[PDB]
Design an enzyme around this catalytic site. Structure first.
Site, PDB file in Angstrom:
ATOM      1  CG  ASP A  57      -1.532   0.980   1.636  1.00 23.80           C
ATOM      2  OD1 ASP A  57      -2.802   1.053   0.498  1.00 23.80           O
ATOM      3  OD2 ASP A  57      -1.329   2.238   2.094  1.00 23.80           O
ATOM      4  CG  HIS A  76      -4.960   9.401   0.524  1.00 29.08           C
ATOM      5  ND1 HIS A  76      -3.650   9.261   0.385  1.00 29.08           N
ATOM      6  CD2 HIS A  76      -4.729   8.738   1.954  1.00 29.08           C
ATOM      7  CE1 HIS A  76      -3.471   8.501   1.170  1.00 29.08           C
ATOM      8  NE2 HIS A  76      -3.716   8.953   2.244  1.00 29.08           N
ATOM      9  CE1 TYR A 115       1.238   6.052   2.355  1.00 29.56           C
ATOM     10  CE2 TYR A 115       0.499   7.536   3.069  1.00 29.56           C
ATOM     11  CZ  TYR A 115       0.436   6.323   2.752  1.00 29.56           C
ATOM     12  OH  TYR A 115      -0.901   5.874   3.498  1.00 29.56           O
ATOM     13  CE  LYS A 151      -3.911   4.531   0.351  1.00 31.72           C
ATOM     14  NZ  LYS A 151      -2.915   4.228   1.257  1.00 31.72           N
TER      15      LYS A 151
HETATM   16  N1  LIG Z   1      -6.428   7.587   4.926  1.00 29.89           N
HETATM   17  C1  LIG Z   1      -5.380   6.969   4.797  1.00 29.89           C
HETATM   18  O1  LIG Z   1      -5.803   6.452   3.856  1.00 29.89           O
HETATM   19  C2  LIG Z   1      -4.314   6.570   5.128  1.00 29.89           C
HETATM   20  C3  LIG Z   1      -4.425   6.556   7.039  1.00 29.89           C
HETATM   21  C4  LIG Z   1      -3.234   5.917   7.540  1.00 29.89           C
HETATM   22  C5  LIG Z   1      -2.397   5.047   7.154  1.00 29.89           C
HETATM   23  N2  LIG Z   1      -2.593   4.022   5.799  1.00 29.89           N
HETATM   24  C6  LIG Z   1      -2.213   3.620   5.450  1.00 29.89           C
HETATM   25  O2  LIG Z   1      -2.251   1.956   5.978  1.00 29.89           O
HETATM   26  C7  LIG Z   1      -0.922   2.245   6.986  1.00 29.89           C
HETATM   27  C8  LIG Z   1      -0.695   1.386   7.904  1.00 29.89           C
HETATM   28  O3  LIG Z   1      -1.222   2.581   9.282  1.00 29.89           O
HETATM   29  P1  LIG Z   1      -0.157   3.053   9.770  1.00 29.89           P
HETATM   30  O4  LIG Z   1       1.030   3.192   9.169  1.00 29.89           O
HETATM   31  O5  LIG Z   1      -0.674   4.851  10.799  1.00 29.89           O
HETATM   32  O6  LIG Z   1      -0.142   2.202  11.319  1.00 29.89           O
HETATM   33  P2  LIG Z   1       0.605   1.127  11.625  1.00 29.89           P
HETATM   34  O7  LIG Z   1       0.533  -0.140  10.776  1.00 29.89           O
HETATM   35  O8  LIG Z   1      -0.489   0.816  12.935  1.00 29.89           O
HETATM   36  O9  LIG Z   1       1.781   0.817  13.209  1.00 29.89           O
HETATM   37  C9  LIG Z   1       2.327   1.417  12.660  1.00 29.89           C
HETATM   38  C10 LIG Z   1       4.174   0.753  13.575  1.00 29.89           C
HETATM   39  O10 LIG Z   1       4.189   0.185  14.293  1.00 29.89           O
HETATM   40  C11 LIG Z   1       5.356  -0.306  14.070  1.00 29.89           C
HETATM   41  N3  LIG Z   1       4.781  -1.754  14.619  1.00 29.89           N
HETATM   42  C12 LIG Z   1       4.882  -2.270  12.879  1.00 29.89           C
HETATM   43  N4  LIG Z   1       5.224  -3.855  13.420  1.00 29.89           N
HETATM   44  C13 LIG Z   1       5.396  -3.625  14.812  1.00 29.89           C
HETATM   45  C14 LIG Z   1       5.423  -5.187  15.596  1.00 29.89           C
HETATM   46  N5  LIG Z   1       5.195  -6.782  14.916  1.00 29.89           N
HETATM   47  N6  LIG Z   1       5.473  -4.473  16.527  1.00 29.89           N
HETATM   48  C15 LIG Z   1       5.005  -3.414  16.916  1.00 29.89           C
HETATM   49  N7  LIG Z   1       6.087  -2.547  16.355  1.00 29.89           N
HETATM   50  C16 LIG Z   1       5.095  -3.110  15.514  1.00 29.89           C
HETATM   51  C17 LIG Z   1       6.308   0.206  13.435  1.00 29.89           C
HETATM   52  O11 LIG Z   1       7.293   0.601  13.621  1.00 29.89           O
HETATM   53  P3  LIG Z   1       8.451  -0.163  13.469  1.00 29.89           P
HETATM   54  O12 LIG Z   1       8.648   0.551  11.330  1.00 29.89           O
HETATM   55  O13 LIG Z   1       9.925   0.325  13.449  1.00 29.89           O
HETATM   56  O14 LIG Z   1       7.774  -1.225  12.509  1.00 29.89           O
HETATM   57  C18 LIG Z   1       4.981   1.173  13.028  1.00 29.89           C
HETATM   58  O15 LIG Z   1       6.167   2.198  13.998  1.00 29.89           O
HETATM   59  C19 LIG Z   1       0.307   2.958   6.423  1.00 29.89           C
HETATM   60  O16 LIG Z   1       1.588   2.969   6.446  1.00 29.89           O
HETATM   61  C20 LIG Z   1      -0.712   2.900   4.591  1.00 29.89           C
HETATM   62  O17 LIG Z   1       0.139   2.456   3.811  1.00 29.89           O
HETATM   63  C21 LIG Z   1      -3.861   5.193   4.353  1.00 29.89           C
END
Ligand SMILES: NC(=O)c1ccc[n+]([C@@H]2O[C@H](COP(=O)([O-])OP(=O)(O)OC[C@H]3O[C@@H](n4cnc5c(N)ncnc54)[C@H](OP(=O)(O)O)[C@@H]3O)[C@@H](O)[C@H]2O)c1
Length: 315
Positions: free
Chosen positions: A43, A110, A48, A77
């Protein structure tokens, strides 16, 4: 089992690698490591600004014969400053060019509100007020549909849409391509029961982001609920000899909802995909579901009073 079939009868893998806030370079390595660990869903997004690094990783793994392009699902997106068709086409060609691909599997709106065109992703006036555009997500969709007819995008979807907004898209005069996914924030404090039921009954799969609660998020406060730290999750995790993160990810897979946990840490990337070797009990799923408090970390909250603001409605 490891995928959900879309309305088109394309398969969307249930686990993908999220990329928001992964710095450039860290991202290329993260995507290489993920492909190696068996990830096929990625994704990425224009805003980004790391798509080029993603594209390098994918090209290199394809060149090496690690994976075939047809087994990858690559999502990007359209950002809200590019709703106007000509600008959409430019934004898209840059996304596809950065990723070095011939087509995207999925292209999403998005965010449902359009923002004023220009160089800034978040345009503000002298006061610091965010500037909106005149173009709506329905205008953007008409532009995106041409991408599908052209073979540049296999399917279109939306992100951060409520069910009334999806209805409006589904009831758009002259609609050609129905949306195939809605990508929304989802975890035990924001389960999205009603929204997921609505999507699945309308031919729409759901992709969960922030399954870990988005801890890296810049505006995290001490008062916020902490998804990683939910006590019931630790318990369920110990029982199944899995990690807390693994339970938080399975919670989504087991509901046939794709998830895209973000990681640039090798251990985490490998671990996050190890979720097809256990099943949560019905009581464990009910216990996780009991946790929703309708709490969100993610969205453009500054524009809550502007016309297209999704998070006012129940679902
Ligand atoms: N509006 C939208 O449409 C939208 C908004 C936000 C995000 N997104 C997408 O969704 C993705 C996920 O969202 P997110 O990035 O906000 O948060 P998330 O995936 O919930 O959390 C990511 C965080 O958790 C850590 N992490 C990952 N695996 C882990 C594990 N097994 N144990 C402990 N910590 C872990 C990561 O650090 P490390 O990197 O060190 O592992 C990072 O700091 C985004 O990257 C993006 O692709 C879309």
């Amino acid at each position: 089992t490891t995928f959900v079939k879309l309305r088109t009868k394309a398969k969307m893998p249930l686990v993908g690698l999220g990329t928001w806030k992964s710095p450039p370079g860290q991202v290329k390595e993260a995507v290489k490591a993920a492909i190696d660990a068996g990830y096929r869903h990625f994704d990425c997004a224009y805003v980004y600004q790391n798509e080029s690094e993603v594209g390098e990783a994918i090209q290199e793994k394809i060149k090496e014969k690690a994976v075939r392009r047809e087994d990858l699902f690559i999502v990007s997106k359209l950002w809200s400053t590019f709703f106007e068709k000509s600008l959409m086409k430019e934004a898209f060609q840059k996304t596809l060019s950065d990723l070095k691909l011939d087509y995207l599997d999925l292209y999403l709106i998005h965010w449902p509100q359009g923002l004023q065109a220009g160089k800034e992703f978040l345009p503000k006036d002298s006061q610091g007020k965010v500037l909106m555009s005149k173009s709506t997500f329905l205008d953007a969709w008409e532009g995106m549909e041409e991408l599908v007819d052209q073979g540049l995008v296999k399917a279109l979807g939306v992100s951060n849409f409520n069910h009334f907004q999806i209805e409006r898209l589904l009831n758009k005069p002259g609609l050609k391509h129905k949306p195939v996914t809605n990508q929304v924030e989802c975890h035990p404090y924001l389960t999205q029961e009603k929204l997921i039921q609505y999507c699945h009954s309308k031919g729409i799969a759901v992709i969960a982001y922030s399954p870990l609660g988005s801890p890296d998020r810049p505006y995290a406060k001490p008062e916020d609920p902490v998804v990683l730290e939910i006590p019931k999750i630790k318990e369920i995790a110990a029982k199944h000899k899995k990690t807390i993160a693994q339970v938080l990810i399975r919670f989504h897979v087991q509901r046939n909802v794709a998830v895209i946990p973000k990681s640039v840490t090798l251990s985490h990337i490998k671990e996050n995909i190890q979720v097809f070797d256990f099943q949560l009990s019905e009581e464990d799923m009910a216990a996780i579901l009991s946790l929703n408090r309708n709490w969100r970390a993610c969205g453009l909250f500054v524009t809550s009073d502007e016309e297209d603001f999704p998070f006012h409605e129940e679902y």
